From a paper:
Among the tested combination of Sirtuins and lactyl peptides, SIRT3 showed a higher delactylation activity on H4K16la and H3K23la peptide. Crystals of H3K23la(L)-SIRT3 and H4K16la(L)-SIRT3 complexes diffracted to 2.0 Å and 2.5 Å resolution, respectively. Each structure contains 1 SIRT3 molecule, 1 zinc atom, and 1 lactyl peptide in each asymmetric unit. The catalytic pocket of SIRT3 displayed half-hydrophobic and half-hydrophilic characters. In both structures, F180, I230, I291, and V292 of SIRT3 formed a preconfigured hydrophobic cage that accommodated the hydrocarbon portion of the lactyl group. While in the SIRT3-H3K23la(L) structure, due to the crystallization conditions involving glycerol, two glycerol molecules’ hydroxyl groups replaced the water molecule’s position and contributed to the formation of the water bridge, resulting in a robust hydrogen bond system.
Author numbering:
A (entry chain B): 21 to 26
B (entry chain A): 122 to 391
The structure:
């Protein structure tokens, strides 16, 4: 649900 | 199976009428705005030689709590009107003017979609906005213009109640996206064509929207490279137009027969 980088 | 010409004919014949669009920093580097995950010798090179350890730290909360000044230098730089939209934006504007644009989902915070004339109701600015701000200490909200004078004056805006640093409602890593993002629940099943322009698809949860359209829906990627779920889990009706994003958009414009409209639109706007 939160902004993240792979 | 499908080509770029196929997609163009689907639009020309009104077989695709409800276009949803996903964009990232790749559509705004031709306007001179460097990509914070692929920077050059401009804004991010200078901040990294002053006090920024790496570019993604501008959008990380622990670093912000430690030194908010790099972020606010970027906020100052992104003041609307400092950069102008390029052909990619005006193509999206044209999609809207011709009644084809269901929604445009953007990961960018440069406001160039709005500057190009796309109405706010067609936009989902999924990574937040400078239009409002929140105190990082007490969580009081503030209109975005209440801190602009400070930012433009190279001052860190602080809360009038508790004096904590007031942060624009830009979505940092580790933060939820705005509730307007949940328009995708209805927008994406309703799209009959998905366009993906200038993005790495390496930032979630935005990237996973490429899987939210129906299997029947063509997914047209206009990007330097095949990326994300489009590369690992291709669908039968995917189309990739690989190379410079501007040249790819211009090729689609020509195949649509919109060259003259585009030229009219640009001169009237620029
Ligand atoms: Zn406060």
């Amino acid at each position: 649900a939160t902004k993240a980088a792979r | 199976k499908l080509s770029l010409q196929d997609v163009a004919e689907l639009i020309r014949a009104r077989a695709c009428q409800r276009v949803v669009v996903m964009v990232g920093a790749g559509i705004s580097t031709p306007s001179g705005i460097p990509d914070f995950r692929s920077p050059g010798s401009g804004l991010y090179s200078n901040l990294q030689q002053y006090d920024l350890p790496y570019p993604e730290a501008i959008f990380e909360l622990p670093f912000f709590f430690h030194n908010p000044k790099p972020f606010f230098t970027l906020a100052k730089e992104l003041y609307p009107g400092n950069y102008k939209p390029n052909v990619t934006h005006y193509f999206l504007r044209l999609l809207h003017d011709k009644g084809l644009l269901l929604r445009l989902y953007t990961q960018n915070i440069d406001g160039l979609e709005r500057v190009s004339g796309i109405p706010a109701s067609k936009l989902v600015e999924a990574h937040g906005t400078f239009a409002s701000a929140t105190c990082t200490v007490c969580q009081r909200p503030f209109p975005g213009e209440d801190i602009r004078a400070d930012v433009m004056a190279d001052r860190v805006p602080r809360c009038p109640v508790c004096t904590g640093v007031v942060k624009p409602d830009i979505v940092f890593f580790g933060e939820p996206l705005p509730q307007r993002f949940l328009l995708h629940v209805v927008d994406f099943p309703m799209a009959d064509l998905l366009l993906i322009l200038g993005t790495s698809l390496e930032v979630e949860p935005f990237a996973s929207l490429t899987e939210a359209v129906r299997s029947s829906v063509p997914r047209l990627l206009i990007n330097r490279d095949l990326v994300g779920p489009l590369a690992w889990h291709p669908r039968s009706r995917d189309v990739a137009q690989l190379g410079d994003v501007v040249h790819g958009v211009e090729s689609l414009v020509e195949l649509l027969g919109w060259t003259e409209e585009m030229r009219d639109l640009v001169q009237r706007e620029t």
